[PDB]
Amino acid sequence: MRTRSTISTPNGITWYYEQEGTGPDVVLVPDGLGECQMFDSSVSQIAAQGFRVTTFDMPGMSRSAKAPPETYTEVTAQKLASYVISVLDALDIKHATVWGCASGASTVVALLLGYPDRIRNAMCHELPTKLLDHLSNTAVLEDEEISKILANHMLNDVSGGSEAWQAMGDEVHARLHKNYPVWARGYPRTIPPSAPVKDLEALRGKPLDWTVGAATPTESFFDNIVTATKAGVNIGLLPGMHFPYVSHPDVFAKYVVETTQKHL
Amino acid sequence: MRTRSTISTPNGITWYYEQEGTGPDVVLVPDGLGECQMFDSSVSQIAAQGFRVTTFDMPGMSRSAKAPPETYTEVTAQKLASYVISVLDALDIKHATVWGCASGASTVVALLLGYPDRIRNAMCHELPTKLLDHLSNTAVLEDEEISKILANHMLNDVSGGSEAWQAMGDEVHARLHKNYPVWARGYPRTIPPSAPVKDLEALRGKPLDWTVGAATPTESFFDNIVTATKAGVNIGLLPGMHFPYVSHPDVFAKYVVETTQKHL
Numbered sequence A, B: 001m002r003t004r005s006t007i008s009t010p011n012g013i014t015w016y017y018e019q020e021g022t023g024p025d026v027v028l029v030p031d032g033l034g035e036c037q038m039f040d041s042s043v044s045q046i047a048a049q050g051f052r053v054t055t056f057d058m059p060g061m062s063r064s065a066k067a068p069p070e071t072y073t074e075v076t077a078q079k080l081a082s083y084v085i086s087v088l089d090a091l092d093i094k095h096a097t098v099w100g101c102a103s104g105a106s107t108v109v110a111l112l113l114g115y116p117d118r119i120r121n122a123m124c125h126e127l128p129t130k131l132l133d134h135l136s137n138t139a140v141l142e143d144e145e146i147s148k149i150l151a152n153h154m155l156n157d158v159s160g161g162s163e164a165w166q167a168m169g170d171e172v173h174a175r176l177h178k179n180y181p182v183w184a185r186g187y188p189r190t191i192p193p194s195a196p197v198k199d200l201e202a203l204r205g206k207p208l209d210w211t212v213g214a215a216t217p218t219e220s221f222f223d224n225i226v227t228a229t230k231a232g233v234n235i236g237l238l239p240g241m242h243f244p245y246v247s248h249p250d251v252f253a254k255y256v257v258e259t260t261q262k263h264l
C-alpha cells in the first residue's frame, strides 16, 4: 500500500512524496523534470523485494512546486543533494540506497561524496557533464514554446520508448508541460559544470554503479564511460535511453534491487 | 592524378588499388565490405595536404575478387594484416600511416602490433570484439537474401548518412551487392575473437588513435571505449556511424591528416 503525501523541510520546500514497502531504504531521485510518477511501477516492484522505496517530485516541479526560487534556479548538484538530504531528514531515512538519472545522477554522486555515512550505495545514470547549446538556448524562449519543443524532444529523441512515454497518461504530461519551462531556465546552464565527477580519485573505491542507455547515441555520454573507467567505478548499460524506468520498468527494477542487494 | 591499377602478391591475391599524391604514405583499409571507392573523395583531400594515399579493395571483395578461398573465409585480423603487408611490400611502401574501420580496425591494430617498424601510426574505428548473432545468422540464408538484407541494413540503420550512402552510385552498390554474402560468411564469426585488444600492455604507449561514431548506439562499441581508456590510448568520436568516410568525408579527411601530422 502506497503512501502519497506531503512533507515540508526548513529550506521552504513542501515536497510531494510517495512511499511503499518495508525494509532497507531505497530512494529514487527523478531526472530534471522532477516527476516521480515516472517510477510508479518500479516503486511497487522494488518494494516487493523487501525494500522501503521513497520517491518525490523535485523542488519547483510537479506537486513539489511550493518551494522558494533558489531551489529551482541556478540548480547545481550540490544544491539538489542538500535538498534531498533535507527530505530524507524529514522522513527519518538514515541510511539510503539512491538512484538518479541526469540531474538526478549528479545529485546522487554528490550525495555519496558529501554524506558518505548516509548513502549505502548510489546508482547514477547518464550524468551530464557538458553544456548543450540546443537545451540552454531554450531558456530565453516563451514558456509555451519551451513546452512544445521539450515535450517533442522527450517524445521522439530521448524517451527510449515512445509508447511507454505516451502511456504515462494525460495527467503526467500536463504536469510535465509546466515543468519544461522551469527546468529549462534553472538546469541546463548550471548543472553540467556542477558535475561532481572531475575529482576522479574521490570516486575511487566508492559504492557507485554507473549506467548509460544502450540505445543512447555514443556521443551523449561517452565522457561518463571514460570517467568511470579511469576511476575503477563499475560502468554498464541499461536498455533504452534517458528514462529506463519508463521504457524498461521491469529491467530497471531488477537492476535497482540486484545492485542494492550487493551492498547489504 | 590518381593511379588505378592492379598488383598481384605471392599469396595468390590480385589487388585492385588506387593511389594519389606525393609525400609520407597514408593507407586506407576498408571495412569488411572491402570496397575502396568509399574513400574516393578523401583520397584526393588527404593527398592534397602532401600525402601519398593508397587504398585497395580487400581480398575476395569488389575488384580484388581474384584471391584464394583462405583469404575471404574464416577471416581474422592477423590474416588481413598479412595480406595488407604483402600489398605494401609489392607497392614498395616502407612506412605507413594506416586507417581502418570494423574489420579494418582490427587489421590496423594487428598491423601496428605485428609490424611496428612499418607503421608510423594507426587509426582504428569501431573495432568489433563481440559475436553478433543477427549478423552471423545471415550466413546460412540465400546469397540474394543476404544482399537484400544487408544492403537495406546499411542504407537505413548504420550508414550514418542515408543520402551520402546512396550517392556513392549504382556501380558501387552493384559491387557491394556481390560482397555482402562473402562478408557474411567469412567475417562475423571469426573477426571478433581475433581482436588484438585483449593484451592491454601491448597497446600502451603505441601510436594508436581510436574512434567510435558519435551517432552509433552506445552499446555497439561501449567496449572499445573501456579498452582504450584502460590502455591510455587516445579515444574520441567522429560524426556518423560505421562509415564516416562516406557520411562526413570532409571531417574524416581532416581527421586523417591532422592525426597523421601529429605523428610525422
Ligand SMILES: C[C@H]1CCC[C@H](O)CCC/C=C/c2cc(O)cc(O)c2C(=O)O1
Binding pocket: A031, A032, A033, A101, A102, A103, A104, A128, A132, A135, A158, A187, A188, A189, A190, A191, A192, A242
Ligand atoms: C531531464 C533530462 C532531459 C533529457 C533530454 C536531454 O537532451 C538529454 C541530454 C542529457 C542531459 C540532460 C540534462 C542536462 C542538464 O544540464 C541538466 C539536466 O537536468 C538534464 C536532465 O535532467 O536531462
Ligand SMILES: C[C@H]1CCC[C@H](O)CCC/C=C/c2cc(O)cc(O)c2C(=O)O1
Binding pocket: B031, B032, B033, B101, B102, B103, B104, B128, B130, B135, B158, B187, B188, B189, B191, B192, B220, B242
Ligand atoms: C561491414 C561493417 C558493417 C556491418 C554492419 C554491422 O551491423 C555494424 C555493427 C558492427 C559490426 C561490424 C563488423 C563485425 C564483425 O565481426 C566483422 C566485421 O567486418 C564488421 C564489419 O566489417 O562491419
